[PDB]
Design a protein around this ligand. Structure first.
Ligand SMILES: NC(=O)c1ccc[n+]([C@@H]2O[C@H](COP(=O)([O-])OP(=O)(O)OC[C@H]3O[C@@H](n4cnc5c(N)ncnc54)[C@H](OP(=O)(O)O)[C@@H]3O)[C@@H](O)[C@H]2O)c1
Ligand SMILES: NC(=O)c1ccc[n+]([C@@H]2O[C@H](COP(=O)([O-])OP(=O)(O)OC[C@H]3O[C@@H](n4cnc5c(N)ncnc54)[C@H](OP(=O)(O)O)[C@@H]3O)[C@@H](O)[C@H]2O)c1
Lengths: 310, 310
């Protein structure tokens, strides 16, 4: 088989050599402009139109968990990927654990009031504070997918009450499952901590706005791990300033890098990470891609729903 | 039976009523000065000499995990507790989980470089940083007891390499056990993170000094969860200033409250909590005390070694 690989910043030769070892019958090459030679599979991140247009590929593997970029490119350029070509994304491949690390650390940070103790330390002021209790710290996960379920699983270990929101009902024994826009208000009413693990789709853009935030309990916390477009940043800032939201830790933003003029940078209740919550682990991605191609070849169960948008 | 209770700041009537429900045959009273009436068990925190002196008690229950205070008082006042009287302390009773919450949150915080991102956020500066790897983040637990083992167990969940140090060899399958002063240098050589869960005894006072810190890997982290006397604070500050130690989170100090003149308060790589790492959970302490008395009465297995000092 023939595999073409494109990624704008990764160690390309590293990936080619790992793919060749994992798929020893494959001829793997880096795609450059002008390469119209035959290919069976394409591995891509932010590919240019010309790399895929007209190609009757057996599959395309997008090298990320999110697919809002490629799907929006395919809508602007319908000629880019034939409907006959299945599109795959990276499910977990190590990003599950990374989301768990981030969420557990920061949920515990807030639960143990390390944010309040830091404020007090800034004034060299010693004062034990009342303990918080699990019953008042229900954690709601917006998005109940590959990453949402991993984050829910790790927080259940700590015995926090847990609820999740998605389009379809979930069956996780200790997690209350809310589904659809018609159940979102009830979902939000109890979320002391709100963790966002939704995909970017037309249906979820701007969903964390003033009406959503007002339905949370007072003194809530927001952990945005998903996409910046999900949050109306001026609405979040107003809820932080009014005390509705006690703290927000944000990995993603409407414009990235976050412009220095944004009030989020210097706001005392905001913590910023520069879109680093979960990165693809190359060796796990190669194992997942190699395994998927083998299953495709054998006609076994294994994918992105372009109509659905994620 | 007769139980006398003394605690200088807890909700005394709450404890008396919970002890009466858990031990319905018991007459429970708060000890005041002048009460020389008979008693079978004493429940105490920082008791005055007069409460125990001359009393042939069946047992004394110290209402804490640490016992350096009462043991030092007994050495200064040998007449206070007859050698015939067994002394018990609170083992876990909820402090296990609290130590796990603290340690897991902060270990993950450091592993994911939230301390570096915070420094960068202070300047509104956006910059992804290289990932750290588990193989470079061995965690060493100084003290391998009730709380040490719980902290080790929770960090193994995250697949960090783990080692522990104590007087006697441990058998935890995935944790390398170092024992005695003669093995401490080898123990320390690999500790990217050093977590202190030792008791305060004459043998461990000042153990985290300049010679210990210099044996750690560069860029190490210190989490002092145990006693302030374990750390020579000026030696820690010199190791922070030289870059040997990248970060220190401290819950305890040689003088408490930490005096405002201490350079630890404003040091950029130090995080301070005001001795709040793990507090006794009253209902769990009552359950443990009630269960222990029942086992004593039935002649079953169940205690502080005064000769040993912890
Ligand atoms: N560094 C980073 O910040 C980083 C890294 C990786 C990924 N991510 C983000 O995390 C996202 C999730 O990854 P994943 O693998 O967990 O995705 P996934 O497996 O597709 O899960 C998506 C979840 O969102 C739900 N959802 C989608 N549209 C919805 C709507 N309109 N209403 C309610 N729920 C809806 C789905 O519900 P159903 O279960 O009913 O379908 C599903 O539970 C990605 O889209 C990406 O944006 C961020
Ligand atoms: N808020 C707080 O900060 C807070 C709250 C509760 C407790 N604590 C602290 O945590 C301590 C530990 O509690 P615990 O219940 O885990 O105590 P523990 O069960 O008695 O464990 C003590 C451990 O320290 C080791 N040890 C004692 N002396 C030693 C020496 N000279 N060299 C090497 N190892 C030595 C013991 O080794 P062996 O196993 O060989 O005997 C044992 O593993 C308490 O003493 C207290 O100071 C702090």
């Amino acid at each position: 088989m023939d595999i073409i690989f494109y990624h704008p910043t990764f160690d390309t030769q590293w990936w080619i050599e790992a793919l060749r070892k994992a798929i020893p019958q494959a001829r793997v090459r880096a795609w450059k402009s002008g390469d119209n030679d035959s290919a069976d599979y394409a591995l891509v991140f932010h590919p240019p139109v010309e790399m895929l247009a007209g190609r009757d590929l057996k599959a395309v593997f997008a090298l990320g968990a999110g697919v809002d970029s490629i799907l929006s490119k395919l809508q602007a350029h319908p000629e880019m990927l034939n409907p006959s070509v299945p599109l795959f994304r990276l499910e977990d491949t190590g990003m599950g654990e990374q989301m768990q690390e981030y969420a557990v650390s920061q949920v515990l940070h807030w639960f143990r009031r390390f944010d309040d103790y830091r404020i007090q330390q800034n004034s060299s002021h010693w004062q034990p504070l009342p303990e918080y209790h699990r019953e008042d710290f229900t954690i709601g996960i917006l998005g109940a997918g590959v990453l949402g379920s991993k984050v829910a699983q790790s927080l259940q270990t700590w015995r926090f009450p847990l609820r999740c929101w998605s389009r379809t009902r979930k069956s996780w024994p200790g997690v209350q499952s809310f589904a659809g826009r018609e159940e979102l208000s009830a979902f939000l009413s109890q979320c002391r901590v709100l963790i966002n693990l939704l995909p970017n789709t037309p249906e979820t853009v701007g969903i964390i706005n003033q009406q959503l935030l007002e339905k949370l309990p007072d003194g809530a916390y927001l952990l945005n791990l998903a996409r910046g477009v999900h949050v109306v940043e001026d609405d979040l800032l107003a809820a932080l300033d009014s005390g509705k939201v006690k703290g927000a830790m944000l990995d993603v933003f409407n414009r990235e890098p976050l412009p220095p003029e944004s009030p989020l940078w210097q706001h005392p209740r905001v913590t910023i990470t520069p879109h680093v919550a979960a990165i693809t682990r190359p060796a796990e991605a190669v194992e997942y891609i190699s395994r998927t191609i083998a299953q495709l070849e054998k006609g076994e169960k294994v994918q992105v729903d372009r109509a659905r948008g994620y």
